[PDB]
Amino acid sequence: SQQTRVLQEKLRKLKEAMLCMVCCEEEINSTFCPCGHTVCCESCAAQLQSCPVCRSRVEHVQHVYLPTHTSL
Amino acid sequence: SQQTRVLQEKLRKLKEAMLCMVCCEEEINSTFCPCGHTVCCESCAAQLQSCPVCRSRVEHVQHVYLPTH
Ligand SMILES: C[C@@H](O)C(=O)/N=C\c1ccccn1
Ligand SMILES: [Zn+2]
Ligand SMILES: [Zn+2]
Ligand SMILES: [Zn+2]
Ligand SMILES: [Zn+2]
16 A cells, blocks of 8 residues: 555665665664764774764764664 | 555564663663663663673763664
8 A cells, every 4th residue: 555655665764764874885883982973884983083963073983782783 | 455564563673672671661872881782761871880781880871862863
C-alpha cells in the first residue's frame, strides 16, 4: 500500500542518520571531544582537526559502542 | 499488507535500541569514558561508578549529540 512506501522512507531516513556525515558509507562510531558531536566513522574522525558541525577544535576522538551498531 | 507490519517491527526495534538501558524511558545521550559504552541517558549515567556493560571504572561521562536525537 502507500503506507508501505511511507514506512520504507522513515526506515531509510533513520538508517541514513546513523551513517557518517562525511563519507556517507560507514556507521557513526566516534565522538569529537570536548564538543560531543557524534557524526563520523573512525576513519573520517581521525582526519578532522575541527568539528564538521560546530568548528570547535578536536582535542581527541572517543570511540562509542552503541546498541544500534550492526555488522556483516 | 504483511510487508507494512514487517517494516513497523523494524522501526520499533531500532527506536527501542536508542533508549537508556537502565530507565528504558529516555534517549541515550551519554558515554562512559574511557570504555566508550554509550547506553544511558544523562540522569542514569551520572550516578554509576562502573560501566553497567563491561564493569570498567567510569573516569567521566561525555555528553553526546547524535543526529538520531
Ligand atoms: C568525502 C569523504 O569520503 C572524505 O572526506 N573522506 C576522507 C576525509 C578526508 C578529509 C577529511 C575527512 N575525511
Ligand atoms: Zn566516514
Ligand atoms: Zn562539534
Ligand atoms: Zn535512564
Ligand atoms: Zn563499558
